[PDB]
Amino acid sequence: APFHVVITSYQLVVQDVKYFQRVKWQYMVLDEAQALKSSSSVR
DNA sequence: CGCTCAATTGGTCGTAGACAGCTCTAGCACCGCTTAAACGCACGTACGCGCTGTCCCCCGCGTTTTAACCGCCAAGGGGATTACTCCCTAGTCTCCAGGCACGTGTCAGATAT
């Protein structure tokens, strides 16, 4: 891949997923993952 | 009375902006197909208030010759243009900052599975 690691936040990712899925990743890093505690969330 | 001169209108180079074919997505009302409502085209059937020539005087018109006026002649002097002089605010673009909308929040206290 031409550029390696991308830095993001949950408010962007829940809208931008359609763009991010245009590129594959080897590994996912998910920081303060308690942001995902609600399975009811759109996030 | 047709030149020389001081300036554009128009021509060639430039450079990146503003198109229009992708390159698909995926949301949706268009197209297909029966179902079903009710009135459109059909249409008698009542009988008419536009037009056809009598009788009689009204309005428009031609003619006439005054005399006001528009088209025109030239000049009058002050205010719009052509151009220089200088002062500011229109646009750039910036960061600040806040209303509308979306979303997680959460857990409470009002309602029901």
From Swiss-Prot:
<comment type="subunit">
    <text>Component of the chromatin remodeling INO80 complex; three different complex modules assemble on different domains of INO80. Interacts with DDB1. Interacts with transcriptional repressor protein YY1; the interaction recruits the INO80 complex to YY1 target genes. Interacts with YY1AP1. Interacts with tubulin alpha.</text>
</comment>
<comment type="subunit">
    <text>(Microbial infection) Interacts with Epstein Barr virus (EBV) lytic switch protein BZLF1; this interaction participates to the activation of early lytic viral genes by BZLF1.</text>
</comment>
<protein>
    <recommendedName>
        <fullName>Chromatin-remodeling ATPase INO80</fullName>
    </recommendedName>
</protein>
<comment type="similarity">
    <text>Belongs to the SNF2/RAD54 helicase family.</text>
</comment>
<comment type="function">
    <text>ATPase component of the chromatin remodeling INO80 complex which is involved in transcriptional regulation, DNA replication and DNA repair. Binds DNA. As part of the INO80 complex, remodels chromatin by shifting nucleosomes. Regulates transcription upon recruitment by YY1 to YY1-activated genes, where it acts as an essential coactivator. Involved in UV-damage excision DNA repair. The contribution to DNA double-strand break repair appears to be largely indirect through transcriptional regulation. Involved in DNA replication.</text>
</comment>
